[PDB]
Design a protein around this nucleic acid. Sequence first.
RNA 1: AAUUUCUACUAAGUGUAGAUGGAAA
Lengths: 1202, 156
Amino acid sequence: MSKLEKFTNCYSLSKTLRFKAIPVGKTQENIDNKRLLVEDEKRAEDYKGVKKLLDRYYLSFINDVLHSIKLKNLNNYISLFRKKTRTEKENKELENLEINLRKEIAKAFKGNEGYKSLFKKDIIETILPEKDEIALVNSFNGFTTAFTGFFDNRENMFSEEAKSTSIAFRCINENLTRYISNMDIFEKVDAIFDKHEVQEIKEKILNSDYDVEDFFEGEFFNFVLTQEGIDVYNAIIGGFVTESGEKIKGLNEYINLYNQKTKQKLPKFKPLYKQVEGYTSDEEVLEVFRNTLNKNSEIFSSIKKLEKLFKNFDEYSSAGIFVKNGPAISTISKDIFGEWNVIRDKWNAEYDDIHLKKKAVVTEKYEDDRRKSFKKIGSFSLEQLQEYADADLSVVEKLKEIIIQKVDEIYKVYGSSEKLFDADFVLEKSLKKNDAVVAIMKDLLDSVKSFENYIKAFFGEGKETNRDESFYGDFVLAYDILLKVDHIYDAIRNYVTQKPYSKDKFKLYFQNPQFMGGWDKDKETDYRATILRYGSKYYLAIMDKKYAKCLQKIDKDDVNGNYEKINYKLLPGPNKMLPKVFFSKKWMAYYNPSEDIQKIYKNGTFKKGDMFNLNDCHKLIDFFKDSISRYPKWSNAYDFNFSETEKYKDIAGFYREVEEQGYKVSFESASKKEVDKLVEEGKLYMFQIYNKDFSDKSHGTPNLHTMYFKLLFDENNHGQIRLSGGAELFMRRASLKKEELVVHPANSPIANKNPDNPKKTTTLSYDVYKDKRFSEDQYELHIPIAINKCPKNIFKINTEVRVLLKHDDNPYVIGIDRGERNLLYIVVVDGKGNIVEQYSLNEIINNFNGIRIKTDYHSLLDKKEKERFEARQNWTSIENIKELKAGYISQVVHKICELVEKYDAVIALEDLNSGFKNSRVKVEKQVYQKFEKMLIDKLNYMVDKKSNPCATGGALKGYQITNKFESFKSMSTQNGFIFYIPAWLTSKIDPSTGFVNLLKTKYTSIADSKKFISSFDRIMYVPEEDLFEFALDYKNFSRTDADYIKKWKLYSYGNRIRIFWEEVCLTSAYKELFNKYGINYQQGDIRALLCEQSDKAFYSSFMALMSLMLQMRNSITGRTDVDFLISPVKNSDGIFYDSRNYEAQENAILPKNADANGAYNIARKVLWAIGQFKKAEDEKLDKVKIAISNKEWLEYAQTSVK
Amino acid sequence: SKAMYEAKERYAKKKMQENTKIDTLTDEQHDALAQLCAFRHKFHSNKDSLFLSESAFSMQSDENSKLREVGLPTIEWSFYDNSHIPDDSFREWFNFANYSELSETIGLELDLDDDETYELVYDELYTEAMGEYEELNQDIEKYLRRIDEEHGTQYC
RNA sequence: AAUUUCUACUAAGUGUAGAUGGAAA
Ligand SMILES: [Mg+2]
Ligand SMILES: [Mg+2]
């Protein structure tokens, strides 16, 4: 019994299929005559309009009753907050008063003229009538419940839970804490009070109320609570126009006049919150883009405010301008210092001078703790960057000139794009076929977006010390406007990358709100939908509500024209259906529940909680048994055969028993001619369930979904597969028209595009239109199933795989690694270390009838990336490539699944959050995470279609070897048969012995190089092998606390590849350098001669040769021919490993090339994890660590071979 | 309805990636919280198909069991008994007060074969089901807000 | 270049081989 005979029927699932539906006979013209499409087209479209009307009435309700509330605890909150801190649980009384104030406005709303009829049924009926909108709100006269996704959230607008969208939290804890802040900051505007400007005009043209000090004194908060009051308040801040050309001044401008003496240093009055994009057509999207980025747009004025802010930046202090820690701080290091790694070096030294000892060597755990302590910090001060900086580095100039360079770059791309915001602009071609216009828009949007990404790190997540609030107050006041460009970026991008066709659909209801919920016989006259089989052309039946019983009075016809017809008896949810029925006032008046039975259910001792009594709940079990026997519908329609009363240790066990059994679909027949005459009468509607496998030409294997759906009505349906309910139906529209499809004509030799087909050209007898499926409409149908509804082998999979792998004795392992020369690379390793099968996954085999036609994806990728290159790298090319990768990581999964079945393994997989991608790899991080998703999705229910359905591994008894996916971090360190493993030191490693370089040999100085060249043990030269054998211990080098052997006798032969494309050899290069500098280098230990020279270029051309002795990976990066991995240390047999030495075999015992080596090492790390799986008890198997360290891994990979 | 779909999910996904370090309390309670949060995001996604008799679905004692094991405070639910949320027992009840309403208009008596009174009780039981489930859902959001503003994380 | 849908196809001629869990903001 191998390692997959356990893992089936382990837990539930719920897929859902999606077949098409063609109407048969006169059903389509019957629908058009009875007009059953216009109603639901309206019932899709008018919903946002009726939402608009109800939002109109709701906002009128708020602005109605807010003119009738004067808060009484407001003074007692304001003064007690602005009382000057010193709480000792007085802030707790402040919060009590705050929630009581929210309760006061909540009580005002509750008693606010009814309000109980604000989310019930009559709101669509009665109040909202009192134009032509009466039919609009009257269009839903028999259909109310679709508003319940609105009547809940607009109720939660009126809560007191301090939620975001609600009224109460806003008007008490954002408006009031802005109002009292402006009340205090009113103390710092009294020194500029000129009545000719602040009083002679504002009070006369705004309110004619009491003057400007009334809005800062706190007793018109009850007047400003309405949105009219917020309008008047933001008028006194900003300045009203009163439809005249005065442009009357505001308090922002009066406080802006104060810095005429070049010192503002007084915060302005922040405006108050009030109380409550394209994607269709080319002219519209161009106009809204003009609206949002012309030379007087709000975003553009925000850039102007930001550039003048960073022009006058030097007046603010350098003690508060916090730069955000994290990703962007590398580019900030690159632009403040010169390299990607200097801030981290200064912080490194600043930390190690405190926590490092008086030695200098490190451990890897101390390095990981060092990295954790560096990621502990939230942000950095600009003053600390001046502290990091040496002389002649003033950040207040450097960042200023950087940002003015960026702003002038945006101005230069405005000078590029100035032909676009002009009034007489023309569209000569649509944006699908035009390039220059859309690439211009792309450059604009990406330039402003890059500017936002550069500005972004000046937040420091707030909640800090005295930060420069006088700077942040306008900084966020421009940044909120600069963040609006994402609403244009995620409008223009998903406008241009959308298909020409369109997948909009509306739910079809057929005049009824209660539509196809279930398939129950004796509820089918209510649900009004049934399913008929005949041969194999399946059918969906819709009965009209005027004639909702056209299937009951049908005879078992004997003139041999029949449709078989379902019955579908399903007891739904038997743990909470049985007490719903057997205590519900009519069963209590038909089948008397015992006096002690009613009491035992009413007290409820059948549940757990220690009130659980076996021979007490067993009488309840017998009562359920006998009553289900006495029930007329459920005595007959199922075959209930339970256990005995002592054979249920839990009523949960009995519920599982009745849930297991209570489902049966059979087929009682019907006529054919009377059914088709009936659908000719129009009392039925009949659709055929159809896809591209129910046709009578399909001479191959079906779609995995049609295999399931054909298996829903088998007598093998014993594997607990169950057609559930919740089915829907849908309807599309003709996105395309028929004429303008580019159509390949008939009887012409049509082209090909897969180059590895021997039939290099073919021809057909008919047409094959481009995208025929969107020419007409089609009825999409969904029919959701629930695989493995009753689970049996239930356990924790993450422990069961481990307790399986320990007791196993030769457990196979797959590895999967990305790469540069190939997309992925599979390596299958035995329980020892022998490579069973190593191959690429660039070529995809399609093993149909007998004919293994392969197809490449790597050539497809590069041939599309050349179009990306030649087409200025625009969005259509980007998303085409992303979808091609998505199709590729679809078609990988069949190979991985079949490989898992063929070798009985556990997949290893490159962990990501410990990873350092390389950029060039073709499958990047986003596509790899999608591969993770579309691998654990499929290994939730592994099935191969060619197998027999009844046998294990089939469509009834699939493998479940994972869990469901949860969250993008919770996918870590184990998932069933997928293991996650850190990808450190997996590509540049000698597979024979395990030598890895750890030597930082990028040249710095002769001051370092002399000690570095003296630290070696014996640089000599062997003449009987012509090799420059080096020798060293590792313990005399920094960053070297991981290796285990540390006795590495290096060598030289095998040429390597430099970059400078720079092809060199090695031992001849060493000899020519040493004959450039004139050495008798045949009497070893030549370090004594090498520590005499004093010119720079000798050591600079020696470091660059040490590094080429150490460089194991060689990419010629223009061809796929020489990607050779060579290792300058040899094993016990005196031969060091070469890749091309191992490429030309059939099945090697070592990796072929670089990507395969990257797979093989990951497989080795999982093998180490299995080795530690073999060395614990079964009581720690859930705790055995898998995160194998660098030290442990190098030790295992060296001492595996010996 | 694709751009905002990806945007609102990758924002929240970034927050679930980001908040795995803020807690810095005894344990990996982030796992239980994100598991609860996605459970919330299924529940509030399609609460409506819980009303159907046999939809693809499948409480409070189970959540409290999986929450006590990690050591959080519990949820303080609104009810534990759960057995009165009406779904498709439309053959298995009678006591409702709005028969006074239904007799104020014509309607018919308490026999549901009339095609007019059927939807007139279906509406009320649908709204009562949704009104029960959001009272459930508010309890989970209250638990997340309490655990949010006690430990300074982000969940809503 | 035919597709419930997505990717690569033309694969023996109205399709082929893998995949796909839907509604909802
Ligand atoms: Mg097929
Ligand atoms: Mg295509």
